[PDB]
Structure formats: structure tokens, C-alpha cells
Amino acid sequence: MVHYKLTYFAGRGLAEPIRQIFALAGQKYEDVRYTFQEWPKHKDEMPFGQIPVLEEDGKQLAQSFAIARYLSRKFGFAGKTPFEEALVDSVADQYKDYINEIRPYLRVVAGVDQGDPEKLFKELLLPAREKFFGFMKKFLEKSKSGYLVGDSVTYADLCLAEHTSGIAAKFPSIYDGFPEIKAHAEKVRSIPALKKWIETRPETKF
Amino acid sequence: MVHYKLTYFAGRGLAEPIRQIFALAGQKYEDVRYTFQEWPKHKDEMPFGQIPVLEEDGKQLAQSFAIARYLSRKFGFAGKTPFEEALVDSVADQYKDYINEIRPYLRVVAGVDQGDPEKLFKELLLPAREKFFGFMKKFLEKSKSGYLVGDSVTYADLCLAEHTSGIAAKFPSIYDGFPEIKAHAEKVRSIPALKKWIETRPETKF
Ligand SMILES: N[C@H](CCC(=O)N[C@@H](CS)C(=O)NCC(=O)O)C(=O)O
Ligand SMILES: N[C@H](CCC(=O)N[C@@H](CS)C(=O)NCC(=O)O)C(=O)O
């Protein structure tokens, strides 16, 4: 039977939406998790010297969004029509831009860089999310479904719900001014197979 | 009949691989270009207040890679199999990461940022491309086709060839230590429909 392996750090980070695609699909996989200490010696194993990396029957696929889209297309979470799949991609790409914007914050919370999460949250994340959540609000207005694109859950939903809920665990004011984005996280995370995964996944700081 | 519009600045930049997909496909489109000056009055029309943005029969799709993939799937430049398509995505996502890395350099040459382009080329671009072209070289070694993934052009190839060609016009030392990357740009840009587009496209600074 097909074998999937996901390799990433011992954390949610860029791998988490991929783990949630597997959960929604009811698809078993090997969840390989590295400490920051163990990781470096495995760098040369990976297509771009980075993680996450998926293996399917021993074939490697790098890049978290390439991996998310590949599995979402296979399992029914990519969008309902070719144009909708593209709309899903555009939202995911806007999310990726936002994450790039807040990278200094994420590196600090992950323990990778030294810093004050609270200060970065206020100075960096709040203004970045004001712009970002503003566009997400627009997509939700258009959909009228509670999901970002179309009438059913996609990997773009998983990315957003995971991010916002993850930050809100530490800094709940992320949702201030944006009750729609809170509603979205709680809608997505209550999908039964996801709710079960969230109940049982390792507790990690990032 | 289907109608496409592409809106971007008066330049190659993020829109150019998309223009090249249309050229390869033999597909007519409305090519709309704004100078830096003319853009602000149009910002709020756009899904994320950024360009490029595609319209297909009046439906907007933003985000350059989402646009490129959508058109590539439609026209035969996305990859031949679902796994190859994902591999193509992964290369394009590494490309995007590289472009992010050299953003400070790009912004100076486009004139958006103030700086020393020669200094940034040597201190930022050369070390970034050494890592990135290293991975691209391994991909070309695997394909044995002259293309990054599989045996025919994909939008990933267009991205790389447009980038390296475009830099090389000013700083041809980008190809130093990477003859295979120069060969790749030459191969891609020699494809007939593309060669013709390159011959006729507006001459722009970026
Ligand atoms: N475009 C990114 C690149 C992945 C990335 O920045 N990888 C990090 C994981 S959060 C990593 O490998 N960190 C350790 C290292 O770069 O050596 C993606 O979405 O996968
Ligand atoms: N993730 C990018 C973002 C698009 C972007 O940075 N667009 C620039 C043009 S290169 C822009 O609209 N700049 C003008 C502005 O933001 O007002 C993409 O691939 O499309």
C-alpha cells in the first residue's frame, strides 16, 4: 500500500496544514520530527537542504505549499473547479506573503532567534495582520460559506485557521477587530477529523 | 470567445513568465501596463491591492504564481503527471524563495529603493544564486533534458530563464561557475513562439 513520510521539526510550523490534510483524508503517514539539534546533519538528504519534505513511495517532494497542494488535489481539498483551485492558490500565496512579513516574530517564538515575542507581536504582527485579515474578510464576504473559497474546506482554510489559532493561544488579541477570522478558525477546527487530530497532536510551542 | 486580460506595470518583473505562457500557447490576451505613476488609482480594484492580476471573462485572479499555474495547467506547461506537476511547483517555490532573498537588490535596480546595486549584487545576489543555482543544477542533472523538471518546458523554466537572462543583461557574471544555467536560459528562450515574443516585447528596465 502507498507509504507517505513527512519530515519536519518537532513543531507545527510549515508542516501542520499537511498533517491536517492527512487527518481529513483519513490517510495514515509516518510523521518524522527533528529537534533543532538533530536536524542539520540531515540537510543534504533534502532536495533544497530544507524541510518539510514529503516522501511518497520513496519519491521526495519538497516545499510546504507544493506538498499541501499535491495532497489536497489527491484528497479533495484543493478547490471544486479549476478556477476555484486557482483562487485557493492565490489566497495561499497571499498567506505566504504575510508569513514572510512576520518571519522575525515566528523565528523568535520558535526559539530560533533571540527576542521578545510580545514586542514583535505588537510592532510587527498586529499591523501585518490588519492588512492580511482585511483581504481574508473580503474573500469570506464573497464566499458566504464561512470558508475562504467556495463552499467547502480547502488547504488555504487549514493554513489560516492553524496560524490564527496558534498565535491566539499566546496572544488572543490577534482577533481584535476581526471576529470573522475567529469565526473561521473555530468553524475549520470543529470539522470532526480535524478536531480529533487537534485533541491528540503533540503540544509544541510553534 | 474566451478573453484574457493581464494587468501589471510597464516592465517584465512578475508578469513576464505569464506573458510567455500566452506566447507559447498562441493565446491572445489584453496586455495592460501601468507606469509607477498611473498605478495608485487602480490599487483598490485588485484582490490584494497588488499586481499582476489576470481576468478571465471578467473574473479576477491575483498572485503571479497562481496565475502562472492556472494558465500552465490549461495550456500544457504545468508538468505531465500529478507528481511531476508537484515537482514543478516545488522548483517554482524555491525560485520564489530565492527572489525573496534578493528583493533588496531587485528593488534598488527597479529604483523603488535607494542603494548601491554593485555592492548588493556582490554581497547579496552572488551568494544567493550560488546556493539556488546549485539546486537548479542538480535538477537539470536529474532531468537530462535541459529543462528543470521532465523533458519539456514548464512555467518553472520560464521563471528561471527570464530571471537569469534579465539579470545577465547588466551583470552577466551571474552565470559565473554556472555554464549549465546559461545553457538553460538559451534553450528556453530559443523555443520559436518564445524567441518571437522576446524579439518583439517592449524594452524595459525591469
Ligand atoms: N518555502 C519554504 C521553505 C522551507 C523552510 O524555510 N524550511 C525551514 C523549516 S520552517 C528549515 O528547513 N529550517 C532549517 C534550515 O533551513 O536549515 C516552505 O514553505 O517549505
Ligand atoms: N506574491 C507576489 C506579490 C505581488 C507584488 O509584490 N506585486 C507588486 C508588483 S511586483 C506590487 O503590486 N507593488 C505595488 C504595490 O504594492 O502598491 C506575486 O507573486 O504576485
Side-chain angles (χ1 to χ4, degrees):
Chain A
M1 58 184 187
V2 64
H3 189 266
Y4 299 101
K5 181 172 64 155
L6 187 66
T7 304
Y8 191 57
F9 294 114
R12 285 163 288 116
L14 306 176
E16 186 61 18
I18 291 150
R19 301 194 188 106
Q20 289 174 192
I21 291 165
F22 284 123
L24 291 177
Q27 169 65 239
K28 293 182 185 186
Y29 67 104
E30 185 182 351
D31 197 27
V32 180
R33 299 182 179 222
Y34 289 133
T35 64
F36 294 142
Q37 188 164 261
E38 175 65 20
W39 156 246
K41 66 188 289 181
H42 304 280
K43 180 166 203 79
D44 287 0
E45 299 173 21
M46 304 316 173
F48 308 116
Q50 287 206 290
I51 46 181
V53 173
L54 178 74
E55 274 183 31
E56 180 189 323
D57 292 354
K59 291 186 301 186
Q60 288 181 126
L61 177 60
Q63 289 282 358
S64 65
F65 295 83
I67 295 161
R69 183 176 306 103
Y70 175 67
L71 304 163
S72 291
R73 283 196 8 190
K74 185 189 295 282
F75 296 137
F77 309 111
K80 176 176 170 215
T81 69
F83 199 83
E84 198 177 277
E85 290 181 81
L87 286 172
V88 172
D89 292 357
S90 75
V91 175
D93 273 357
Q94 185 76 8
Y95 175 77
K96 181 176 221 157
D97 286 352
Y98 161 77
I99 295 298
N100 185 69
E101 186 163 5
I102 66 161
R103 184 186 325 278
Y105 170 86
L106 302 165
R107 286 173 58 84
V108 168
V109 175
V112 168
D113 291 342
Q114 295 171 26
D116 180 339
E118 165 96 297
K119 184 165 162 270
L120 262 343
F121 166 85
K122 277 186 267 173
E123 296 188 351
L124 186 47
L125 197 157
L126 286 179
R129 74 78 163 84
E130 171 78 26
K131 289 174 291 173
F132 176 53
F133 287 9
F135 299 122
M136 294 310 92
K137 190 181 182 168
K138 293 171 35 162
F139 274 76
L140 292 167
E141 320 187 317
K142 173 111 204 178
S143 84
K144 304 169 282 86
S145 75
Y147 303 110
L148 294 161
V149 185
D151 293 333
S152 61
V153 70
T154 69
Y155 75 90
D157 296 302
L158 298 176
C159 289
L160 184 66
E162 175 53 43
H163 173 253
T164 65
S165 69
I167 307 298
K170 194 180 182 66
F171 301 111
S173 71
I174 189 184
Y175 292 123
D176 286 5
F178 294 101
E180 299 94 349
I181 310 298
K182 198 170 184 178
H184 169 89
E186 292 185 351
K187 181 181 186 74
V188 173
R189 288 159 52 84
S190 63
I191 296 167
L194 185 44
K195 186 176 173 162
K196 181 169 165 191
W197 168 247
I198 293 167
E199 290 169 342
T200 63
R201 72 180 171 180
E203 193 80 42
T204 66
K205 72 184 188 201
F206 81 96
Chain B
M1 58 189 63
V2 238
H3 178 81
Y4 296 100
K5 175 170 63 156
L6 183 61
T7 305
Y8 189 60
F9 295 110
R12 286 164 284 114
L14 295 181
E16 184 61 21
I18 294 156
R19 300 201 190 97
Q20 293 180 11
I21 290 159
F22 280 122
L24 294 178
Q27 170 67 236
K28 285 176 142 177
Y29 69 108
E30 188 179 356
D31 191 35
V32 173
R33 302 180 178 219
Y34 296 135
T35 55
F36 293 170
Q37 299 95 104
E38 297 187 19
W39 159 241
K41 43 181 249 166
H42 301 286
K43 189 190 211 318
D44 284 11
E45 307 173 25
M46 308 309 172
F48 309 114
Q50 282 200 298
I51 38 182
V53 169
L54 174 79
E55 286 188 22
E56 177 188 317
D57 287 354
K59 315 173 274 178
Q60 295 183 123
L61 171 66
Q63 282 286 173
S64 62
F65 292 79
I67 300 169
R69 189 181 302 102
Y70 173 72
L71 299 173
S72 296
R73 285 179 24 178
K74 185 184 298 287
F75 297 137
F77 311 109
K80 290 189 197 61
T81 70
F83 200 77
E84 197 179 78
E85 283 183 276
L87 287 175
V88 168
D89 290 355
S90 78
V91 170
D93 270 0
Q94 190 65 17
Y95 174 79
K96 175 177 250 184
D97 288 344
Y98 162 77
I99 289 309
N100 184 239
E101 177 171 13
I102 67 162
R103 185 180 186 264
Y105 166 82
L106 298 173
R107 283 184 75 84
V108 173
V109 336
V112 207
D113 286 12
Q114 291 178 283
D116 185 339
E118 299 274 339
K119 184 169 174 75
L120 293 162
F121 180 90
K122 75 161 284 269
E123 301 175 358
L124 217 211
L125 193 144
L126 295 179
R129 74 78 167 83
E130 186 187 312
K131 292 178 286 182
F132 175 54
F133 286 7
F135 299 127
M136 296 303 97
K137 176 181 188 182
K138 302 278 198 186
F139 272 82
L140 289 167
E141 278 159 359
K142 184 166 212 182
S143 79
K144 300 187 193 314
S145 73
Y147 300 107
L148 291 164
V149 179
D151 71 351
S152 59
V153 239
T154 69
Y155 78 91
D157 292 299
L158 303 170
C159 287
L160 182 59
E162 171 58 33
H163 174 255
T164 64
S165 275
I167 304 305
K170 179 187 227 211
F171 284 122
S173 78
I174 200 192
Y175 291 131
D176 284 1
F178 296 103
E180 65 299 317
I181 302 296
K182 183 173 175 190
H184 162 91
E186 284 165 359
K187 179 185 195 69
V188 174
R189 291 159 46 84
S190 78
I191 303 165
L194 181 46
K195 182 171 180 290
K196 194 156 204 340
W197 169 247
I198 303 314
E199 271 159 16
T200 62
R201 60 185 190 181
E203 243 286 321
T204 55
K205 177 189 79 219
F206 72 90

